[PDB]
Design a protein around this ligand. Structure first.
Ligand SMILES: O=C(NO)[C@@H]1C[C@@H](Oc2ccc(Cl)cc2)CN1S(=O)(=O)c1ccc(Cl)cc1
Ligand SMILES: [Zn+2]
Length: 395
């Protein structure tokens, strides 16, 4: 069990894994209720009007986006009952990912991918970067800063627009310099989108969650591909999807990144070797050096000096970029999914995966030994139409 506490939205704030928090935006938000579902991983059942203050309006833009399908409902996820159902849906999707060997590995990589402590201006000093923490409220209304890797939060205006984002640094490129940064996944377990293979099917939301987690893996290890490298669809998406589209990046080009991130891990190793002091109270310098030794799989000699093992690196790199793909999860879930990143259709559905009669950790929609178990009838929006309320596309 990846999440052993089955939280309910109205559960009392115990201050440890159930609390009112603020995120490091500097937009003086009001604390929201959040739930720590696992070490380093929090869930926030709210529409995301926080990560970007430029978008605090859950209202439609005058013209609809041409692609992909978009959906707006300013009242979705505004009630404690939806918040409770959201919380329970997100949790069940984690368990489903965890129940596979690919996912269990991905989640582990995520939990140990602590963002680097490159916060200080003194190069010999380790310091946490504040945008990689959350402020947790205390009985007396004071806040305690807590580190974390991952926050799952509800969607912004466009309810079906799922994304992995994070706070930037004024000088550093945290998602592309090996450092990594706390990841915020805009995601809903309450909706999904369709695709044709006529034959109209729905995407299993576990595949969608795994997709975002894969982005999060890249960004937590600071090896994400610059979103201005497209071809429009960006390399980062092609890589994340995997399968046929993954090989749209010739080997030589890939070797450029493979080396560009080898030397980025090289630097981190040296910054670590040259550290003489640390900021904060709980963590010793050796402790943090250790954390980062696990994260990046560094090699250490008897004198406690770190170096980058090129074979260890290759394994980690390909593990995060080639083995952790949506294509591969599709195989492990034994579900049906579109074959190319763009092979979707403009269909969005309201769904409800909480009830076991609709969706299970092991089978998803394709419930075992039933009609739904044959030819992914579970995912057929017409055969299993009781689980996919087709929604009015926005235009
Ligand atoms: O890749 C995504 N997130 O990691 C995309 C980006 C955004 O959306 C898209 C989808 C396709 C294009 Cl060309 C542009 C924007 C969000 N989704 S997604 O939630 O994974 C998604 C949503 C709806 C569809 Cl129909 C397909 C994928
Ligand atoms: Zn993506």
């Amino acid at each position: 069990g990846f999440v052993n506490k089955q939280f309910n939205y109205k559960d009392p704030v115990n201050g440890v894994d159930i609390a009112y928090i603020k995120i490091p935006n500097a937009g003086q938000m009001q604390p929201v209720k959040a739930f720590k579902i696992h070490n380093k991983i929090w869930v926030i059942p709210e529409r995301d009007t926080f990560t970007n203050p430029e978008e605090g309006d859950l209202n439609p833009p005058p013209e609809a986006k041409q692609v992909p399908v978009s959906y707006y409902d300013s009242t979705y996820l505004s009630t404690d009952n939806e918040k409770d159902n959201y919380l329970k849906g997100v949790t069940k999707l984690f368990e489903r990912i965890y129940s596979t060997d690919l996912g269990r590995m991905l989640l582990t990589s995520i939990v140990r991918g602590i963002p680097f402590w490159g916060g200080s201006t003194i190069d010999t000093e380790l310091k946490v970067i504040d945008t990689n923490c959350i402020n947790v409220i205390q009985p007396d209304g004071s806040y305690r800063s807590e580190e974390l890797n991952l926050v799952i939060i509800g969607p912004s205006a466009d309810i079906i627009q799922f994304e992995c984002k994070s706070f930037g640094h004024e000088v550093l490129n945290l998602t592309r310099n090996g450092y990594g940064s706390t990841q915020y996944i805009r995601f809903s377990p309450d909706f999904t989108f369709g695709f044709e293979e006529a034959g109209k099917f729905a995407t299993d939301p576990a595949v969608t969650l795994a997709h975002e987690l894969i982005h999060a893996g890249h960004r937590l290890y600071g090896i994400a591909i610059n979103p201005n490298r497209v071809f429009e669809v960006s390399f980062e998406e092609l890589r994340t999807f995997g399968g046929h589209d993954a090989k749209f990046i010739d080997s030589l080009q890939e070797n450029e990144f493979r080396l560009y991130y080898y030397n980025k891990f090289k630097d981190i190793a040296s910054t670590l070797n040259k550290a003489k002091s640390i900021v904060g109270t709980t963590a010793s310098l050796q402790y943090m050096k250790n954390v980062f030794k696990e994260k990046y799989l560094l090699s250490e000699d008897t004198s406690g000096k770190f170096s980058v093992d090129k074979l260890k690196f290759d394994k980690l790199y390909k593990m995060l970029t080639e083995i952790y793909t949506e294509d591969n999860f599709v195989k492990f879930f034994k579900v049906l999914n579109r074959k190319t990143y763009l092979n979707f259709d403009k269909a969005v559905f309201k769904i409800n995966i909480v009830p076991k009669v609709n969706y299970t950790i092991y089978d998803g929609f394709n419930l075992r030994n039933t009609n739904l178990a044959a030819n992914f009838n579970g995912q057929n929006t017409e055969i299993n139409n009781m689980n996919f309320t087709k929604l009015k596309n926005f235009t």
